[PDB]
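FAQ
Q: What does a multi-component entry look like?
A: The components come first, one per line:
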Amino acid sequence: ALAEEWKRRYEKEKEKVEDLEKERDFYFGKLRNIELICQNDPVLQRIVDILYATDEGFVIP
Amino acid sequence: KDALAEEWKRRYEKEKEKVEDLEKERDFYFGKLRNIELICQENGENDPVLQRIVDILYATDEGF
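Then the predicted structure of the entire assembly, as tokens:
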């Protein structure tokens, strides 16, 4: 019965992985689309800098 | 038979490691979209290119 409990937790975690990678690819696809649109204007350069920022933002507006 | 529960346990640990990395990558990409959205809102200057980027931001995936 311990097999039963751990197989259930593995399948719960695997479903969370699949939902996260679907949401990640959804956002990543838009970012690739926007880079193609940008591919010189200072506003578009700021957008390109956002695409290639090495860390998540934190600044309060 | 005894190693069966240990194998399911190990596969659960591998999936839990993927979650923590996927959440950071998800927040990383979503944060970029929020920043691009903010730049488009602040810019206004009747630019068709920025309007195309806004339409990409809010386009829906008929599959999601």
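Q: Is there any commentary attached?
A: Sometimes. For this entry: Chain B touches chain A at residues 4-5, 8-9, 11-12, 15-16, 18-19, 22-36, 38-39, 43, 45, 47, 49-50, 52-53, 56-57, 59, 61, 64 (CB under 8 Å).
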